[PDB]
Design a protein around this ligand. Sequence first.
Ligand code: HEM
Ligand SMILES: CCCCCCCN1CCC[C@H]1C(=O)N[C@@H](Cc1ccccc1)C(=O)O
Ligand SMILES: C=Cc1ccccc1
Length: 455
Amino acid sequence: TIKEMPQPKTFGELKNLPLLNTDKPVQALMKIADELGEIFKFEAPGRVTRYLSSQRLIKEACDESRFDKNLSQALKFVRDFAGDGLFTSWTHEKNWKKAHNILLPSFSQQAMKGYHAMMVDIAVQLVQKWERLNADEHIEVPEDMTRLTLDTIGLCGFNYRFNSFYRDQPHPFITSMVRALDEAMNKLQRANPDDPAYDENKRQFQEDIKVMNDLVDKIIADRKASGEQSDDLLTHMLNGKDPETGEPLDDENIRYQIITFLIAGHETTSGLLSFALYFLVKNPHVLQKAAEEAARVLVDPVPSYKQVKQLKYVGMVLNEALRLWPTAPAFSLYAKEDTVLGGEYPLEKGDELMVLIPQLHRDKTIWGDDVEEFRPERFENPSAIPQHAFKPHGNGQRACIGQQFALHEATLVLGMMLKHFDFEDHTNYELDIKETLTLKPEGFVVKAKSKKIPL
Ligand code: HEM
Ligand SMILES: CCCCCCCN1CCC[C@H]1C(=O)N[C@@H](Cc1ccccc1)C(=O)O
Ligand SMILES: C=Cc1ccccc1
């Protein structure tokens, strides 16, 4: 039963490349999936991939004996500054498993307990900013979520204070990061990226990579000159030994990991919190239930590690926000050997797949007719959810190493937000999703009314 898979419209020798000539390429691809179904071929000059959107097919793609992580074009471009750090290394590069072994302990239960106080430090700064707004001032949500999440990974991970809440403009790191991600996204559709027309793009890209590396150098210099004793992510990077190869990370790889963790360790968590607050103000019944939990659990001025673990409904809110808008919205795979997908689509060794996560998460055969509805209760029983229906953290040994960090931070912060404020969608905000490879609301604003509960 070998089927022929559909393909969206082509542009002569450019094949499908011009379909990416948009500021919202993931959302365009979602619309193509709407039209063509669970699988479609997508070609560019010298490259073919296949976009998967159904749990039926993605559950086979998640078989690690058959498929391994692939670097999408996006990740090949990001590798220009993230190197063979964990996010952009191939599974078979020595430095992937070596850094995985060395850094996995930085996300253990013990490590998360050790991060908790510094997470609260930043969370309290967010709450204080909002308590100090004047009447009818509003909150710029993605902007403040980025302040929070960048500062949290900087402090917990590296004992470095970006002091984002002391700035009315983004930290220089954020400015250059966003511009670098923008460039990587825009470069996806460039048929002739070496045309001199993109000389300025190349210069600006290089300049943004230098800004990011300059900050890395300071983080490293400050640590090695410090007299204080840290036991954080940077400590493991500088001192941890791979049980297997016996070696620590070398200096070049450490720099890549710092860049990787500064970016991966906050950008998608800012998106998550922004989407979560959006869905909460758009669903006041859900907001109330989550606020009720926050009030019952967060009985002290400062939340404790144990209390955040009891914010179980807030946890389902965040999972439901990751279902509708997973902020790292795709990952890529290649076939390890010849194999047949779904009994219908033969693949040769090396053939590429793209997993289109927001479309997977809209599979009506999994979630039912009400798929566009925000209902955190869908997550009450993970055993009732079919395998590989829900993949916001990737797959297998290449799944997100920072998942627990992200969810603890987001649960803590959303819990405090709901404990301390009522929220008003005073503009009846129309969801507008900005793409920077990752996804985040743009222009989302709210008003907060303080419950006047002291910290
Ligand atoms: C809600 C927030 C987050 C989401 C949605 C997310 C999602 C993902 C996804 C989908 C992947 C797989 C990428 C691929 O297969 O190509 C990934 C990998 C990764 N994430 Fe996360 N992530 C989040 C937060 C974090 C945080 C906070 C950190 C660091 C503290 C982190 C560190 C990483 C790393 C290092 C990898 C590469 C892992 C490896 O292959 O060894 N992520 N993440
Ligand atoms: C950084 C964490 C999020 C990463 C998400 C990446 C996911 N892309 C983000 C923007 C769109 C989406 C994607 O479909 N990209 C493909 C595009 C592509 C396919 C075939 C030929 C040429 C180019 C790719 O990059 O290969
Ligand atoms: C380099 C890794 C990365 C991870 C998330 C967003 C942008 C970049």
